[PDB]
Amino acid sequence: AAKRAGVTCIVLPAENKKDFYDLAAFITEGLEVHFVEHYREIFDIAFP
Amino acid sequence: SGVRNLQKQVEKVLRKSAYKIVSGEAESVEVTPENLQDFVGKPVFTVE
């Protein structure tokens, strides 16, 4: 769904770094993922 | 605390071994800890 909308970045809990990599590589082309666990991380990957 | 979930895992591993037997290459599957992530994939929990 994020691919359909033209999204070009995405942020997921680090605990799902597993499942996201099961997907076929063509599905994952063109995204730029940022796994994270503690919330402070996200604050620095959105605003600045 | 229950054993039901581990029962699911060991089941999965075994039947995948059967698939390596009946058509695959090895005549005798030998699970090893280094081998395991192949059969059952990536770790789920870590950060207890």
Q: Which residues pair with B41 in a beta bridge?
A: none
**Interface residue B48 vs chain A (CB under 8 A):** no
Q: How many CB atoms lie within 10 A of CB A35?
A: 14
A32 near A8, Cβ under 8 Å?
yes
A45 near A36, Cβ under 8 Å?
yes
Point out the residue among A17, A18, A37 whose CB comes nearest to the CB of B41.
A18
Which residues, other chains included, contact A28 with Cβ-Cβ below 8 Å and sequence gap of 6+?
A: A20
Which residues, other chains included, contact A9 with Cβ-Cβ below 8 Å and sequence gap of 6+?
A: A31, A32, A33, A34
Beta strands A10-13; A33-36: pairing state? parallel
| C-alpha gyration radius of chain B | 13
Please name the helix (run of DSSP H) or strand (run of DSSP E) that holds residue A13, with its range, or none: strand A10-13
Mutate to test the interface with B, among A15, A16, A20 (most CBs of B within 10 A): A15
Contact A21 B42 (CB under 8 A): yes
Helix ranges (DSSP H) in chain B:
4-22, 36-40
A32 near A9, Cβ under 8 Å?
yes
Q: What is the resolution of this structure in A?
A: 12.0
Contact A15 B47 (CB under 8 A): yes
CA distance B48 to B39: 24
Please name the helix (run of DSSP H) or strand (run of DSSP E) that holds residue A33, with its range, or none: strand A33-36
